[PDB]
């Protein structure tokens, strides 16, 4: 039916993070940004739009620039508390299509895309029938690390919530998990 979209998830691995070489807090690697065109899908075309909310303890705030999509300038992220001693995570979200804004996570919930719905509550996405997202995760060194192998959980980063303009999928209150896939990192001297 036609307000039948299905959601599933967008995640980053643990794993794509290279080898880390060693004041604080400091990012010491970025994960590879990952794309998924159909965190909603399976409805009828509609006007629509992500927000995430995000679901790990803050620890912290840093200034970074995301060497992957399209980021110029600096932002302020915080630092998400995953459960390792010394560590946290910064997110970045955007839109599915290649020139959406990197969108910082930096608050208890912003719109991924469109971004223009964070300053106009009447903007949804032009007509389409699904909803993508394009996730970007970076580690954060909060003090000195040791070297050698550190374990890094699975995590939930956080829920995209699905809004609508027509109300009765804008009623299902529809959502996706944002995944931290877990791992091991690498850290030398």
Do not use: C
């Not at 992957?68 to 998400?80: K, L």
């Not at 060194?141 to 699975?154: D, E, M, Q, S, V």
């Amino acid at each position: 039916g036609p307000d039948d979209y299905v959601p599933s998830q967008i995640a980053v691995n643990t794993s794509t993070l290279p080898g880390v070489v060693i004041t604080y807090p400091r990012v010491i690697g970025e994960l590879a940004g990952t794309s998924n065109q159909y965190v909603f899908n399976g409805g009828a075309i509609a006007l629509m739009r992500g927000k995430f909310t995000p679901a790990l303890p803050k620890i912290g705030s840093i200034t970074y620039t995301f060497h992957q999509g399209n980021s110029r300038d600096s932002s302020d992220f915080d630092i998400y508390d995953i459960g390792v001693s010394g560590l946290g995570i910064i997110i970045g979200m955007a839109g599915y299509w290649p020139a959406t804004p990197l969108v910082p996570i930096n608050s208890s919930g912003i719109y991924i895309d469109p971004v223009g719905a964070n300053t106009n509550p009447n903007t949804y996405n032009g007509a389409t029938a699904s909803f993508g997202a394009r996730l970007f995760v970076a580690f954060v060194a909060t003090g000195r690390l040791p070297n050698g192998y550190i374990t890094i959980p699975t995590r939930q980063l956080g829920t995209i919530l699905l809004e609508a303009k027509r109300t009765s999928l804008n009623n299902k209150g529809l959502t996706a998990p944002v995944m931290l896939n877990g791992g091991r990192i690498q850290v030398q001297s």
